[PDB]
Amino acid sequence: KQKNRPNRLIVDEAINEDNSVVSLSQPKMDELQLFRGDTVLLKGKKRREAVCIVLSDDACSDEKIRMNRVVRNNLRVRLGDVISIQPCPDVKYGKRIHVLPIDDTVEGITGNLFEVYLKPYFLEAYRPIRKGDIFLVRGGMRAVEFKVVETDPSPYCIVAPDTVIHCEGEPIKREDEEESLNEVGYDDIGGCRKQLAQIKEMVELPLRHPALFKAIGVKPPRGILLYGPPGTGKTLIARAVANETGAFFFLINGPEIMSKLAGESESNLRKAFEEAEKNAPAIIFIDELDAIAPKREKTHGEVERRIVSQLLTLMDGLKQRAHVIVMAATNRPNSIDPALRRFGRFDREVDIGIPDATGRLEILQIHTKNMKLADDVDLEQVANETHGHVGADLAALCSEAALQAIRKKMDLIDLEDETIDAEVMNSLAVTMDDFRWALSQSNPSALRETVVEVPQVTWEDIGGLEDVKRELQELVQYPVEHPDKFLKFGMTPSKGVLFYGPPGCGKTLLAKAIANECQANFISIKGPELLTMWFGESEANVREIFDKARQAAPCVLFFDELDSIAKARGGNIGDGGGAADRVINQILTEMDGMSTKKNVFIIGATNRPDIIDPAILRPGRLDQLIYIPLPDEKSRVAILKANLRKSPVAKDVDLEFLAKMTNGFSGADLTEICQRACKLAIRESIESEIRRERERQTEEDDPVPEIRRDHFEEAMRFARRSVSDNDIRKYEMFAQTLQQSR
Amino acid sequence: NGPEIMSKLAGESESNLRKAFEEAEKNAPAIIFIDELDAIAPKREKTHGEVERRIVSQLLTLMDGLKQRAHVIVMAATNRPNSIDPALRRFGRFDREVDIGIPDATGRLEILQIHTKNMKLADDVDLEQVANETHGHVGADLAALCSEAALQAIRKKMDLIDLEDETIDAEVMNSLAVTMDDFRWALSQSNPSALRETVVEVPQVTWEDIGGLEDVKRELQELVQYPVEHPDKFLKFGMTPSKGVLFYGPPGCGKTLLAKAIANECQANFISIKGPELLTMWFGESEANVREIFDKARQAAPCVLFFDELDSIAKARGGNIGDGGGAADRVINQILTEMDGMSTKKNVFIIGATNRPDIIDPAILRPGRLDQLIYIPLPDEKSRVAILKANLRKSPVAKDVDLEFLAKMTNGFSGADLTEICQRACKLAIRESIESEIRRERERQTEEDDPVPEIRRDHFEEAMRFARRSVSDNDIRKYEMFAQTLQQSR
Ligand SMILES: Nc1ncnc2c1ncn2[C@@H]1O[C@H](COP(=O)(O)OP(=O)(O)NP(=O)(O)O)[C@@H](O)[C@H]1O
Ligand SMILES: Nc1ncnc2c1ncn2[C@@H]1O[C@H](COP(=O)(O)OP(=O)(O)NP(=O)(O)O)[C@@H](O)[C@H]1O
Ligand SMILES: Nc1ncnc2c1ncn2[C@@H]1O[C@H](COP(=O)(O)OP(=O)(O)O)[C@@H](O)[C@H]1O
């Protein structure tokens, strides 16, 4: 019999949320001789079966199958296991079903469960079922499970519209074999994909195949340290990993240990390891490690040092045993004992970090999973206006929105008539106004720290700068792809670039655009940060900056306003000193001593190129000078089009005339003409609306919906240059005399 | 070990520390090893408690009672000598000190060979590449690197491939090989090199990389290699040799190369202290770290201590006009102090280098200090040919190019500027090659005829139209006034 090649696949994560759709790739589907929508039969561990409608996708391999968590848990398999697939063309429509609830799930549910939950689920969707499964329905701010007990064309069928359901009986007990579905899994973690990938590949072999480490002498990693700001969900990630691998999970925590007597604390710390060890494979989680093992000089007492030393010897005695893994959580790497971050104790480090806007949209979708929002609610808006929020903030935001909806209406309205139950709660919807109320007030964003992400600016927002774009392509994207020519010719690529030119000519845009192109992370350090390090006399924080750059590779490190400190202590005349300062010296030091191939590109920008320290233009540092000049008419047209593409402007306006009229204008000045025109338009519109509201009321004829020629004329009479002729001639002397200095 | 002792009760800790010595003693000969000595015996004021001082004193009397017995040896391990109790580093307790240190590239190749001893690597794996690209790794890093490579090979293939068919055993594991791609994957990511400290080793630059400088080479031979071999004439004539030299000249003329080359010739270790280190000591107001520098020089003898950019601090506080002060600074004073008071025979040679020879403190040119001035001048055509050949010897260049014409065309060029012409030519060549490859890939695919495998005359012409001088005439005349007026100052 042939079973290995046509009938074997490997389980992985899902993208769809339906509990019956199983997704696979088109080559396997025309290899299995299966079309879309055909019910398929899956066999897994412990002779369990399931019937599921099939679907095709493209973002898969040719041996991976994507199934949801319900269907996966219904076969007793876990991720990375193998199953058997078959075509089942002999399913028929049912004529009698009987379903029961699980008593652990139904608590405080009053009314009847049929018409609120089982009526919209099997509505206009032919769903297949098999006797003895468990499915899940979401709604009324709860998630209720249901178990099938019988089927009339036994033991499996399809739910047709004329299939009666006898929802008769009392709740049934959850046995000791299946696991609950209110637990944590990888699906309940929004954002943070790369770090999840790292941790999953780091604990795959020791926890899935434990016997393999009795057949080879190879030491797997045993110390993992997660860090990030509080409220980023680290214990979540721990329980998730521990549940998806089926491993045992023990939990130790700081305050509970440090609130006991001496002997009891040591005895608990010892018993945790002993117990943990006995059951295998296991995971031990120590959250708030900073509390129990701080810096040495911060342990002013005596018993604290005993606890730290006890933890040290306990960690050091697991170098032989390969089935136990220890994970811990902190807030920053430099807040714990330095003798812990060594080989054998905590050698792997992961940084969770703050979510990006797409991650924020993911978290908002996670927490409103069974809330029954209205139709006007646009979560993209909310995800774009919560800059500085972590997962706990978004959870609290959704909860506050829900509580405002329950409070405002439907509780005082019915308090004088009847009681509350599930049917009036399921009909309750939340509106966008509640989200705006919760988003306006009572929400202190808890972030004043740096952000690292892939930016949103792209090449289509920059008018002109073609040669600069080409040279940026050459400097950034070649050695990260094709090392062949660089080894063949033996020459090493550069790792720095210095932009210069008149101010307000689009130097930050180029940096953001080239970071977005290569899909590499972006870090920006403005002028005030360097000046804060200068005044405060604490240049030991440059060491932190580069560290983040290193741990988030590939990356782009952008230093704008590099002439800030050189201008602070006098202009070109300066003080009695020279050109050497503290912070730029630390930059030179930290820049010279880094990896020759780590894929970290450093960009500088300055509009006063002469008063900069010439010791940074030496090789091995920023040594590729690029000149960003003032635009020309062919480029001014492109700048104006790029600025105006976002707002509705009429067709009678001619851009070419406005472009040729502004000679010597810097690109940062053509962008405020647009702002002034829009302010005039908004003023005119509000004035006309108020005139209509006050004319009769003390017929939809839009006064003007866009900008016209007269608004541009009024705004253009306020046109202002921003760079003089002498400044251009100074830049041009620097350009002509670019030779015969160094 | 430290933590196991410091995690007990008082009486139990003392009793274990005593029992260790008694039992150890009985069996003879023995060795007692105390790792993490820094933990159990830190500095006195860092023992804020009471029982810690009792433990340190107990260790002191236990060490002091083995002065009679000659069969027991005590070894200990720390991280730095100035992190433990000063009363331990005395005669009778811990009088011999060894520094292990960071491995060199040949040592790194040795460690990589140790740990892949039974791994069955493939044929394309070139460990020399890996040993040349892991600058900043210690033995544990290399062990982890090899283990990660092995685990990647076991994970990627041969585990998911056979999970749907059979089990794993020894015969399928011996047929498993690791490829160079796994080593590149492990070497790219997940490997934070844990080193930001100084390196000491014998360099790789030799005399065959320096074009010209014959008389300077001869005088360097005389100054460095004679007294370390033949003390006979120096005792017979009673005159003592010098121990310092000061290079000077225009910038970018190969002063670091000479230092590295003479260190490689005599097979002595090399230590380099750039400008930014001195400037961090100046701004940070912590010139107590010069004392550490010389210590390493002493413990790694024979050696060469090279101070480049010695005029950094003198230029930081104004130029020749400077501030209201004079020519004395903090760090250079510490250098004078630490340099005067060292052994007359330890074989440690100190080299200085500066391209602004006038604004330096004249108190360093006195005897017993750097008092052998050497002048590194701008090259000439016969030397420019050698510089160009030395730079181009590593890359494939065609035969139609004539170096003598390019050499005579560049007059007054400093050697650090002829080395970027080569870089520019190679960048143009690499751009041309990538462009032609992309043209072939996009021409038909939307027959091995190499477009150009080397550099030709046209690339050199295009790069040469960007030729830039870097030193003016007035600067040469300033150096020449200093050279002519080298007499009648000191
Ligand atoms: N060539 C250009 N194309 C498109 N927009 C431009 C261009 N030049 C300037 N801008 C606009 O000018 C704004 C400010 O310019 P910016 O990119 O900050 O240059 P900058 O000099 O580095 N910053 P600053 O010196 O403080 O003005 C940007 O937000 C753009 O909207
Ligand atoms: N005579 C020479 N022979 C060979 N290479 C040379 C010579 N002179 C300069 N170079 C090259 O110039 C480069 C930089 O010169 P370098 O030896 O650093 O002189 P330097 O003045 O001490 N350093 P710097 O002042 O920052 O340029 C070296 O890496 C060599 O490749
Ligand atoms: N990335 C995320 N995905 C899903 N939920 C998150 C995320 N980040 C934070 N949260 C939510 O906010 C809380 C933050 O986690 P935390 O308070 O650190 O863990 P716990 O209290 O479970 O130990 C959790 O209750 C979690 O529901």
Q: What is the DSSP string of A440-499?
A: HSS------S---B--S--GGG--S-HHHHHHHHHHHHSTTT--HHHHHS-PPPP-EEEE
**Cα dist. A349→A75, A192, A391 in Å?**
35, 15, 21
Q: Which of B156, B199, B203, B160 is nearest to B179 (CA)?
A: B156
Contact B471, B437 (CB under 8 A): no
Contact across the interface for A550 and B189, Cβ inside 8 Å = no
Q: Which of A468, A465, A476 is nearest to A518 (CA)?
A: A476
Using a CB–CB cutoff of 8 Å, tell me whether A309 touches chain B: yes
Round to whole Å and give the CA distance between A423 and A158: 28
Instruction: List Cβ neighbours of A313 (8 Å cut-off, separation of 6 or more).
Output: B3, B4, B7
User: For the domain B200-375, what is the CATH superfamily, name and number?
Assistant: P-loop containing nucleotide triphosphate hydrolases (3.40.50.300)
Round to whole Å and give the CA distance between A685 and A662: 28
Round to whole Å and give the CA distance between A568 and A584: 14
Interface of B with A in 431-450 (CB under 8 A): 431, 433-434
Interface of B with A in 242-301 (CB under 8 A): 274-277, 279-280, 283
B260 burial type by CB count under 10 A (0-12 exposed, 13-18 middle, 19+ buried): buried
**What value does the CA radius of gyration of chain A take, rounded to a whole number of Å?**
32
Which amino acid, A589? T
**CA triple A249-A287-A194, angle to 5 deg:** 80
Residues in chain A: 742
* DSSP H or E stretch at residue A316: helix A303-316
**CA triple A534-A538-A543, angle to 5 deg:** 110
Phi, psi (rounded to 5 degrees) for B62: -65, -45
Round to whole Å and give the CA distance between B224 and B235: 17
- Tokens describing residue A188: 């309940």
Using a CB–CB cutoff of 8 Å, tell me whether A197 touches chain B: no
Contact A141, A428 (CB under 8 A): no
Q: Does the beta carbon of A674 lie inside 6 Å of ligand 1?
A: no
A67 burial type by CB count under 10 A (0-12 exposed, 13-18 middle, 19+ buried): buried
Distance (angstroms) between ligand 2 centre and the Cα of B134 equals 25
Instruction: List Cβ neighbours of B480 (8 Å cut-off, separation of 6 or more).
Output: none
Breaks (C-N over 2.5 A) in chain A follow: 698
CA torsion A607→A613→A617→A622, rounded to 10°? -60
Report H helices in B345-414: 381-392, 403-409
**Cα dist. A165→A115, A122, A159 in Å?**
11, 10, 10
Q: At what angle do helices A582-592 and B275-283 cross, to 10 degrees?
A: 140
DSSP A339: T
Contact A437, A396 (CB under 8 A): no
Round to whole Å and give the CA distance between A191 and A631: 41
> Which one of A218, A485, A489 has the shortest CB-CB distance to B151?
A218
Strands, sheet with A521-525, edge to edge from the N-terminal-most edge strand = A521-525, A555-559, A600-606, A496-500, A625-627
DSSP A117: I
- Tokens describing residue A566: 């050189």
Contact B83, B42 (CB under 8 A): yes
The closest ligand to the CA of A237 turns out to be 3
Q: Does the beta carbon of B422 lie inside 6 Å of ligand 2?
A: no
> How many Cβ atoms sit within 10 Å of the Cβ of residue B312?
23
**Cα dist. B212→A552, A560, B409, B422, B468 in Å?**
46, 43, 18, 18, 22
Which experimental method was this entry solved with?
cryo-EM
Instruction: List Cβ neighbours of B165 (8 Å cut-off, separation of 6 or more).
Output: A4
Q: Does the beta carbon of A228 lie inside 6 Å of ligand 3?
A: no
Using a CB–CB cutoff of 8 Å, tell me whether B77 touches chain A: no
Secondary structure class of B366 (helix, strand, coil): coil
Say how many CB pairs under 8 Å bridge A and B: 129
A492 burial type by CB count under 10 A (0-12 exposed, 13-18 middle, 19+ buried): middle
Contact across the interface for A741 and B168, Cβ inside 8 Å = no
> Which one of A10, A215, A309 has the shortest CB-CB distance to B7?
A309
- Tokens describing residue A168: 């008769």
Interface of B with A in 33-52 (CB under 8 A): 39, 46, 48-49, 51
> How many Cβ atoms sit within 10 Å of the Cβ of residue A525?
18
Round to whole Å and give the CA distance between A147 and A412: 37
Q: Does the beta carbon of A391 lie inside 6 Å of ligand 3?
A: yes
Q: Are strands A82-87 and A9-12 parallel, antiparallel or unpaired?
A: antiparallel
The closest ligand to the CA of A240 turns out to be 3
Interface of A with B in 199-238 (CB under 8 A): 201, 204-205, 209, 212, 215-216, 218-220
Contact B89, B103 (CB under 8 A): no
Round to whole Å and give the CA distance between B48 and B31: 32
Q: Which of A432, A434, A427, A382 is nearest to A407 (CA)?
A: A434
The 3-state DSSP composition of chain A as helix, strand, coil percent (nearest 5) reads 40, 15, 45
Using a CB–CB cutoff of 8 Å, tell me whether B134 touches chain A: no
Distance (angstroms) between ligand 3 centre and the Cα of B359 equals 63
Q: Which of A738, A534, A508, A470 is nearest to A617 (CA)?
A: A738
* DSSP H or E stretch at residue B271: strand B269-273
The answer as to CATH 3.40.50.2300 being correct for domain A452-627 is no
Instruction: List Cβ neighbours of A52 (8 Å cut-off, separation of 6 or more).
Output: A20, A21, A22, A39, A40, A42, A67, A71, A128
> How many Cβ atoms sit within 10 Å of the Cβ of residue A415?
10
Four-residue CA torsion sign, B37, B38, B44, B50: negative
**Cα dist. A717→A339, A564, A668, A687, A710 in Å?**
68, 34, 17, 22, 11
Contact A556, A508 (CB under 8 A): no
Strands, sheet with A165-166, edge to edge from the N-terminal-most edge strand = A134-139, A142-151, A97-101, A165-166
> How many Cβ atoms sit within 10 Å of the Cβ of residue A349?
16
Which amino acid, A666? S
Strands, sheet with B269-273, edge to edge from the N-terminal-most edge strand = B269-273, B303-307, B348-354, B244-248, B373-375
Round to whole Å and give the CA distance between B10 and B57: 13
DSSP string covering A493-520: PP-EEEEESSSSSSSHHHHHHHHHHTT-
